[PDB]
């Protein structure tokens, strides 16, 4: 009697839609929200229409389904990021947000300097011998794993590690401008 149940639905529940929408408008105050909530109520009501006892007042039953889906909507929105929609995001807002972000609103000058040499660092690296500079560059500038650093310089792991630790020492000596930055 499944199609009989859905026909009973189209006979009984559908003429209640106007009053149910009036109530949804009362409790949402936004017509698009009320339409969304009424269609949600209809999904939740047609899903379990067998569970309604034929004969009693289905107005109150559907109204309770409406109020319960509204309550669940409020509880779910309380668990979402609270969003306020704006016509335009303000420059003050972009900057305020940039104040707590992992990367700021960077300027063209910052980018330019970052793409230009860091003279104190470049000279220190150029002071090292070739093998040591290459080992430290591959190791803790590009971050390769030590076996890969070996395979690029075709020397065993131990001697790449030797070159690495000793080039780190030599650069630690060469960089007295760590105190300027540390």
């Amino acid at each position: 009697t499944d199609e009989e149940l859905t026909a009973r639905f189209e006979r009984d529940a559908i003429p209640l839609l106007d009053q149910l929408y009036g109530g949804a408008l009362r409790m949402t105050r936004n017509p698009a929200d009320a339409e969304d909530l009424l269609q949600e109520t209809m999904v939740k009501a047609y899903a379990g229409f067998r569970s309604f006892r034929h004969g009693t007042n289905l107005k109150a039953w559907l109204y309770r389904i409406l109020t319960n889906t509204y309550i669940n909507s409020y509880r779910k929105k309380q668990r979402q990021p609270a969003e306020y929609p704006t016509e335009q995001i303000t420059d003050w807002q972009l900057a305020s947000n940039a104040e707590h972000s992992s990367t700021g609103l960077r300027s063209a000058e910052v980018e330019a300097l970052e793409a230009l040499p860091d003279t104190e660092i470049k000279e220190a690296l150029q002071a090292l011998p070739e093998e040591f500079r290459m080992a430290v560059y591959y190791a803790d500038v590009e971050g390769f794993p030590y076996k890969e650093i070996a395979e690029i310089m075709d020397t065993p792991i131990g001697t790449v590690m030797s070159r690495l630790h000793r080039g780190r020492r030599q650069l630690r000596g060469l960089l007295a401008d760590v105190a300027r930055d540390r």
Binding site: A32, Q39, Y46, E83, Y84, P85, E87, Q88, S96
Partner: protein, 195 residues
């Protein structure tokens, strides 16, 4: 008319019906009829037919089928162009575009759920109409009926608004823009200067 005579025709509601009509549409036939009407006719029928021909003759050049006027897939703008930023207070500010796309998504998914549940045709039709209306808002809000509103009964600016006015991209960001190496200050006379 469907209970009897049902296997003799197809009828339907909505954009799917409009899409079928465009499918069965013979552009050469209608273009020829309109050319005939404008050549051998006179009066306001001539003028209305010239109006109607401006569309068909244009759709009659290098493909460009009118099927593009009905959509089965909506494109979603890259998310950088619709930012979401955290505010002092733990609250967020989102561009309206995200609320519009979110209503489209919600209604499309609810329509999927109804189609799966084999809901009454009246309810599924309600959901299809709501989906149409939410895409209408996304594209050009307020153009038909009420505009989707945010708090303070403020109509959400759609994709059409982003382009129009002295605030749209054309007048606000392409024909003029903020520049670097520029300053501003009060002026004083300084009569000792040269021209």
């Amino acid at each position: 008319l469907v209970d009897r005579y049902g296997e003799y025709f197809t009828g339907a509601m909505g954009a799917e019906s409009i899409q079928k009509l465009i499918e069965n549409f013979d552009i050469d036939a209608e273009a020829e009829s309109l050319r005939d009407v404008i050549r051998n006719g006179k009066g306001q029928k001539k003028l209305r037919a010239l109006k109607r021909l401006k569309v068909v003759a244009a759709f009659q050049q290098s493909g460009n089928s009118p099927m593009g006027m009905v959509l089965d897939a909506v494109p979603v703008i890259p998310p950088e162009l619709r930012p979401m930023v955290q505010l002092d207070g733990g609250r967020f500010a989102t561009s309206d575009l995200n609320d519009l796309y979110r209503r489209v998504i919600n209604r499309n998914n609810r329509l999927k759920r109804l189609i799966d549940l084999g809901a009454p045709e009246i309810i599924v039709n309600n959901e299809k109409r709501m989906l149409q209306e939410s895409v209408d808002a996304l594209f050009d809000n307020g153009r038909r009926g009420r505009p989707v509103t945010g708090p303070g009964n403020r109509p959400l600016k759609s994709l059409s608004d982003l382009l129009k006015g002295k605030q749209g991209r054309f007048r606000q960001n392409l024909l003029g823009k903020r520049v670097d190496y520029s300053g501003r200050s009060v002026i004083v006379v300084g009569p000792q200067l040269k021209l």
